[PDB]
Subunit: 483 residues, 4 copies
């Protein structure tokens, strides 16, 4: 009571659960929702990236709609330089994933040399870098009603600021282009952790991305970005082929009526939760913070409601890439997400996730849901999960516990990819593998304990749930008290 | 199926309800959420007000934080002039409420260069002198700014500085009066102008609500008092404030500065839930479509904000600068209309009705049992409307508290009742002007047929559809005891 | 809250609902579960039948497995003589239905002593060897003797025959079934209990016998064997109602499984809104004792909690020594169990399982039931000609009694099949003014309810009528005058 | 879906759950509801008791309302002789508990002269307190043993078969119901405030005798208040501090004071016989469902007793009402069901035990576990006790994989008790080296106790595995599960009680 919105947590109805929400009930220290940040001129710097990690960044998203492979290579180097500067203290080290966002079948403008419009759309490539208030270039070859309205820069253009390489939307380009082929091949070379595939329209599109990543990138998680009507209508087949989903609201809000976007968002988040696959809510969550240090009330509400919807990650696309207040934007998402995680009606969520879950003979699945139930019974400070591939941690997150899921791994890629799942706080263990299997299992558990104690996830008198295996397929649950 | 998100309506779980939301499931024609629009330079004209009414406006909010009584009088005149221009056709006539928003215990600025519409661009790091000398009351600019509560400050972030703007001192315990002398005058002016409701700013306690009611006196005893919760004290004392008030406004603008911005959604959802639980109107207000002040399309967060407020259970949604001073007031009104309809169809009515009854007390009031019976019957047959004859509005309010999917066509001869009905989700008020028939049954039928004709013309239903009709057995207020499931004639 | 277990009614969980059941919370006067009594030598007299009506009897069951048409004709005469002796006072008159229980496709055989392990050679069912295989079981005399045609005595001892699991091909209607059924049409019975219904085609054959003259006679299919349970859905769709004939069912299927079939059929009938009867041995010990056993009290109560519209008495009233007490016991327990129903969950699930239809009568009925819960109504008064409007209300299982007012005597008698319908037969002439005819019939329900103690002046009741001088679509929440 | 009523288990509503119950859906082999049998002339023999164990008996109930200490001692000897004759095979051995049922504050009549008299309806009977007629009870005069009788009355004899209506050191009544009046029959004064002691001198004598004979539990008759339970515990003292005290709720006061009685007791018995005389018979089902619900809510054992299969005293098959009564008691949530005359004096004791076993198994599959487990959690308190979190986590896991068993290592039984309170579908195989723990476990729904007799292994971890494999072998032999199935295994991290914190989801070896 008076903490973690626990009074609201015990209500017999969702209506009373709302009525008991208390701004004076402080949340726990731990924050479950992963934060993805688009890197750009305002945040490419190593000094900024270090502070962005401390502010809550978990995934660095690189939009390959602009920039050369050389440019992104230096960005990744800076990201990894900032990340590895905390490796001197493995208790406080934070794994940071690198995400590749494809250009996709996008129609883009050219370079300004931005300008304020209060316009001849050329297709001659001599203006492919000479665009401005009067000139503007376009890249769609198979282009040609008289053509009434053309939406530029996420439908912004009415006058405004027209930047370089802005987007154009027409509510037959290939799913993956050769330029796309290159970027993922480059992403495989740079050992990125995940791929954000733009404008995925069908399941065949997802299979093409996987073939390109091939055996070399077989562990690269493919997150399909639903940005248009076709993606929504074929969502089920896209989700089955993908490792996760991004609700790309920017383009989606242009391709489909703006008043329907919340329907598509809640549909995809629900189905991803139902499938136990990660879902990302993206774009314009804190749009005004590009120029202002404080978000609007609608922006604060959007982030909170995305977490309440069940989103695994929330994104900043330009608030961190080019805005004037990148650190504040990340901190705001951290603050809002933590408050919203406490406001989740876990009583109903856990019940429906279980009732919608299949009866299986898999010991790990039964063990994971048992750990989540136990963590509710004792209001656990954490669920510690030992995992090599991440699956054990993913299975716990799918049942959406209140307590944070501390995944201990020796696999760095597994550690970085874990950010895709709500509640997984990955820790990279660096102690040598013990020759005795039980002692190596135990060794990683004490590692998770020390991180949780140091970060303030739990204290003396709390209780934690520990998930391990029994043979050299995690099937062992231990309820141990925190010293 | 395939319509009004009815596939999502039949889900056994809220998770499956989310999974079944369909962007290709078109909503019904009727829109249940009331729309309140702040009137200002962008919307004072009769021509604009005419288009704002057609675009979906139900309540006109006049902020007395700025402007003279003379100025506001012409605003009310224009609102009523635009409203009465549709009175030549009572089938499509739309009652429009007038709302008075008090200044309250506000720290406000003054006129930029002697003009309310004038603005200045402040730059980061600039120096600004805050003055209390009334020689700058009407002469504020990028260098000097007068206030009604001198200080040399810097600009931690610049922007457009307009006239009669707000100032906030978080974390403190201000000593400004709940009702000021200026508030008393504005409140008396509102009683004289026959406004329908008062939005009382910065209500911190129940004593505040009672003082506003005393000023409204006997002449304004029927003026609805909506307490604006804008600060820490208002949230902590919400139950006693709600008990004293006729309704509640989540005034997120000031609330988002007074309390941490990341906590505002908690206070919003708490208050909407408690008003829903109490059956009193609740308004979600401010910055819902802020970007539409300068842009013709809202941001994705703003579209989400309106939808979720409706899903939260808000009776009304508000527009401030988007309609008072923005460049796209009609589009902002139309955007709220479009989103509200979509979100109204996405409500999980199965669970909502379920909790509303269980949280409702067993009463011997025949009107209450009749209202909840009408809502159940409207769910059973997916009725096109619940027609309610009401004199004071009470009968219609009791139906709205149980949140039916179908629109509530409240028929009244009382114009003030017609205007105030906009405060409740789903009440579509129609002002009947026909003479009272001496035979009660024929007077009842006359008003029922009036709602029928409105519903047909509006595309709510057609002949052969099924509607729920709530009437009384004796003329007057308090005898609503008859529920009929009738085919449209 | 101290009455009708209303404290238990407000529990948020069924477990807490159980925890709040209070032996000191008295039930209401009205009793909702219909009571069906088999009439026989112990209850045939006019004087006894009068006391049985006063004690709660709603339906008189005549088992045509025994007795001649002459005998049953005199039984019906006595039932109607006792019933009609209260007709001089329509406030205290109780419509009493007459039910014909068919012999059906029955297999029949001093005494002889059978020994365990001995062999028996079977030599009136001429087609048994084609429906039983080597190793099949045969049960004789209410399951007393069991055999395994060269049979082996599995259970010995010193009549009716059951072939469990076996697909018996005997005709649905026998020649004497046709004659008995035709006799029932001649005697103007209200309902038929069709024994050993195995498939939907069986129900259609019974309906064929009743013809146009008995087109309004309700057919209650008796589920008595494995095939009937396995084909229940098609049987229920074809029938007007269902009887859980536990006597024979307990022989045809393992006795430990009978409760599964009972709760299955009651649930499915509740889901369809069709009457269901729980029958046989409910108070069996009261044949010889004036008080029931604890198991028998529990059986009656749990049948009501299951959702059965009626409970039945067989030997307890046909041949036992305490028929009045057996009827009174069922009346008392049913009332206690009706107050112990978790109406919060029941009403919730009945609506969710109900289809969204554009039928005004359906919307009116569920709206009336919802309103009756909101104001703790003393009754739901329904004016009805066919009973349909009253049946639609009963399917949503309100706590309050449903006073169905009708001028149709058959409608009044058949209404007893539905939980909660208290039928009253209005006999006043139709008034030329429509509204005065409605008011006359509503005030009749008013006076009946007041006299029976269902409510008093100033209480609140729900009234269901029509709006123009042909379908019930008007609900009024009125104080009792 | 075709077994254990699993289709009905997945219904979104209890109504649909009813609609999906399938007589062709066979239950699992395991039977969770404990069976208590009253021992008497029909069942005292070692040979009969042997068959009673094989037919399903878990608890032998000895009614000390009759019989000498010598008599009951020989019954206990036969029970243990019959029980230990299966110890030659520890895989199939079944621990059998011995339960002492007290006489309590009982009012009994005098002696007639198998002599009995026929009381006739409408006739008159005089109640006398004069000890001269203590062995001269006839059709007109009847003696009893209650000192302050005529004061607390302004009457029911022989289990309520005979009912009297008083008309006046004496009393004049009129026979409301006739029947046969034997010697030392029982008398009920419904509602009247009886001042008889909770524990009598005879009760103290029997209770001390039970400690000497090492009984596992006491069925305390006519518990009216918590002070009564406390008096029973005082008599049992430190020597019998581990004897479970089961309070029998048989009267109005016990129901009204149930919460305080339940708090003081180890369990509760719904003694429907006397309760059905003390309160109106039509209300007994209310008191049954209240007490079972509250015992389920408190996590303490509850027994449904008396007349469950009454007709089987003379008949080899039960009535349809009796079969329903057994099933519905299990559906209510009763941990154990009881037989009284059906096994003590009836002609078909074996069949009565077999029928209860059969019905209970069928009813256990028909429980709506979705709603039951859900409410048990919501009504359960958030605690920092690791054993509590481990228990509810294991049960949740057991539903997820439809486990063949939940194997629990326990010395005192507590770990196994905490699992049973959440009512899993799967049986709880409690492995113990404590024979008293094995016998007392029968009080809890679903706990199948197995008494391990292997020597303690020198390596503690190997001793744990030995006991887990023992449970595996028991489950294999009883047909609870087979190789390749999945079971939940509950153990501790340290030796000794109170360290059960480890849940393993393992395939059967
Ligand atoms: O239920 P109880 O009495 O707490 O017994 C459980 C104990 O059994 C064990 O699982 C092992 O048994 P032992 O203590 O006999 O070695 C302990 O770890 C555990 O604490
Ligand atoms: O590409 C995106 O992220 C979008 O359109 O939102
Ligand atoms: O007054 C208001 O609307 C606010 O402060 O948001
Ligand atoms: O025929 C019957 O009623 C039976 O078998 O129960
Ligand atoms: O004593 C008993 O067991 C009873 O009364 O049932
Ligand atoms: Mg995009
Ligand atoms: Mg204001
Ligand atoms: Mg304000
Ligand atoms: Mg028959
Ligand atoms: Mg007839
Ligand atoms: Mg039969
Ligand atoms: Mg005893
Ligand atoms: Mg007692
Ligand atoms: Mg007793």
């Amino acid at each position: 009571i008076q903490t973690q919105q626990l009074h609201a947590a015990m209500a017999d109805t969702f209506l009373e659960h709302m009525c008991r929400l208390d701004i004076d009930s402080p949340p726990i220290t731990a924050r479950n929702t992963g934060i993805i940040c688009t890197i750009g001129p305002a945040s490419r710097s190593v000094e900024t990236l270090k502070e962005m990690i401390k502010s809550g960044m978990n995934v660095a998203r690189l939009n390959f709609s602009h920039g050369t492979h050389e440019y992104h290579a230096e960005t990744i180097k800076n990201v990894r330089t900032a990340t590895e500067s905390f490796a001197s203290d493995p208790i406080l080290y934070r794994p940071v994933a690198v995400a590749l966002d494809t250009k996709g079948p996008e129609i883009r403008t050219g370079l300004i040399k931005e300008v304020e419009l209060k316009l001849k759309i050329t297709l001659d490539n001599a203006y492919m870098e000479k665009c401005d208030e009067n000139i503007l270039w376009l890249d769609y070859k198979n282009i040609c009603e008289v053509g009434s309205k053309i939406y530029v820069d996420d439908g912004l253009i009415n006058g405004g600021s027209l930047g370089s390489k802005k987007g154009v939307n027409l509510p037959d380009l290939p799913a993956v282009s050769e330029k796309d082929i290159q970027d993922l091949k480059f992403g495989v070379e740079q050992d990125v952790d995940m791929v954000f595939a733009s404008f995925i329209r069908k399941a065949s599109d997802v299979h093409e991305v996987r073939k390109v990543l091939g055996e070399k990138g077989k562990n690269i998680k493919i997150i399909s970005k639903i940005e248009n009507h076709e993606g929504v209508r074929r969502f089920d087949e896209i989700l089955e082929a993908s490792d996760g989903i991004m609700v790309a609201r920017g383009d989606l809000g242009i391709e489909i009526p703006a008043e329907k976007v919340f329907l598509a968002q809640k549909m995809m988040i629900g189905r991803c939760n139902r499938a136990g696959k990660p879902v990302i809510c993206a774009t314009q969550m804190l749009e005004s913070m590009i120029k202002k240090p404080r978000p609007t009330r609608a922006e604060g509400s959007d982030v909170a409601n995305a977490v309440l919807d069940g989103a695994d990650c929330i994104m900043l696309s330009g608030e961190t890439a080019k805005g004037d207040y990148p650190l504040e934007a990340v901190r705001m998402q951290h603050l809002i997400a933590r408050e919203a995680e406490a406001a989740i009606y876990h009583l109903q969520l856990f019940e429906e996730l279980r009732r919608l879950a299949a009866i299986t003979s898999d010991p790990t699945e039964a063990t994971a849901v048992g750990a989540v139930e136990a963590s509710f019974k004792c209001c656990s400070g954490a669920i510690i999960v030992l995992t090599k591939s991440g699956r054990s941690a993913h299975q716990v997150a799918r049942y959406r516990p209140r307590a944070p899921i501390i995944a201990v791994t020796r696999n760095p890629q597994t550690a970085r990819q874990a950010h895709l799942y709500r509640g997984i706080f990955p820790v990279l263990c660096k102690d040598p593998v013990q020759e005795a299997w039980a002692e190596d299992v135990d060794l990683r558990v004490n590692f998770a304990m020390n991180v949780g104690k140091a970060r303030g996830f739990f204290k003396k008198g709390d209780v934690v749930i520990v998930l391990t295996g029994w043979r050299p397929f995690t099937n062992t649950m231990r309820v141990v008290p925190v010293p």
